[PDB]
């Protein structure tokens, strides 16, 4: 029953059925009175899920080639920060098997075969596991809530079978999800200010914290 940063306008719709329902809504964004296209109580918890899971793949992924290079498990050519890895070819470009403009077309082809399927399950649940898709359309049916399908592919260890266990574990997903969005936003501002990768930013601060903070470094 922990409640922080809440208002009586915010608790009119945040009744606690959400996983990360801590009452934090000062602006009043999940109000069902003016629910529209993207500012509505059906898309916004599901938007935090997809932004949470891409940031948990993002915050872990932008530091993993830098941590693994200091301990000596990957080559130093790939042991590079995230910004000088072909993402922003101004601050640095690394030569992959393809140039990143061709890799972007390969990205949105595979994202277009993955996020269009994720899109139409939100508008109508279970309507995608009917048409033939490579003999694997039966597993891609999903639940009523489109943030958690829980099929044979997205729950392939079956972890969280109990309803009380799965609901409490959904709280740990969004709280690790929300920390990862502030990490990637923290990764973004440190890449512009410090100009060096985030694992070097942790190692610089762990040696001299009073001389390598945000105030000293730009």
Comparing every residue's Cβ against ligand CLA, the nearest one is 192
Interacting residues of 8 by C-beta distance below 8 A, sequence separation 6+? none
- Binding residues for ligand CLA, rule: CB under 6 A, are 192-193
Contact partner at residue 39 from ligand CLA, another protein, none, CB < 5 to 8 Å by partner kind = another protein
Q: In the bound complex, what is the minimum distance in angstroms from residue 214's beta carbon to ligand CLA?
A: 11
Look up residue 118 and give its two tokens. 């994720």
Q: In the bound complex, what is the minimum distance in angstroms from residue 97's beta carbon to ligand CLA?
A: 32
- Binding residues for another protein, rule: CB under 8 A, are 5-9, 26, 28-29, 31, 33-37, 39, 90-91, 96-99, 101-102, 105, 119-121, 123-124, 127-128, 130-133, 193, 215, 218
What is the phi/psi pair of residue 8, to 5°?
-70, -25
Q: Are 23 and 5 in contact (CB under 8 A)?
A: yes
**H helix runs in 33-162, sequence order:** 44-61, 64-70, 100-112, 115-123
Q: Which is nearer to ligand CLA, 133 or 193 (CB)?
A: 193
Q: Which is nearer to another protein, 58 or 83 (CB)?
A: 83
Interacting residues of 142 by C-beta distance below 8 A, sequence separation 6+? 121, 125, 126, 128, 129, 149, 150, 151
């Amino acid at each position: 029953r922990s409640l922080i940063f809440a208002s009586k306008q915010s608790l009119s719709y945040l009744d606690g059925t959400l996983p990360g329902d801590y009452g934090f809504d000062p602006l009043g964004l999940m109000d069902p009175e003016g629910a529209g296209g993207f500012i509505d109580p059906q898309w916004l918890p599901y938007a935090e899920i997809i932004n949470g899971r891409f940031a948990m793949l993002g915050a872990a992924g932008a530091i993993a080639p830098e941590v693994l290079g200091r301990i000596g498990l990957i080559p130093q050519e790939t042991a590079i920060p995230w910004f000088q890895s072909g993402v922003i070819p101004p601050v640095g470009n690394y030569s992959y098997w393809a140039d990143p403009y061709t890799l972007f077309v390969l990205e949105m082809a595979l994202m277009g075969f993955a996020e269009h399927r994720r899109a139409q399950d939100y508008y109508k649940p279970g309507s995608m596991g009917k048409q033939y898709f490579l003999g694997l359309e039966k597993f891609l049916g999903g639940s009523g809530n489109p943030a958690y399908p829980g099929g044979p592919i997205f729950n392939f260890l079956g972890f969280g079978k109990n309803e009380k266990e799965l609901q409490e574990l959904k709280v740990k997903e969004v709280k690790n999800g929300r920390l990862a969005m502030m990490a990637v936003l923290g990764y973004f501002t440190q890449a512009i200010f410090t100009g060096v990768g985030p694992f070097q930013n942790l190692l610089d601060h762990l040696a001299d914290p009073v001389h390598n903070n945000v105030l000293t470094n730009l």
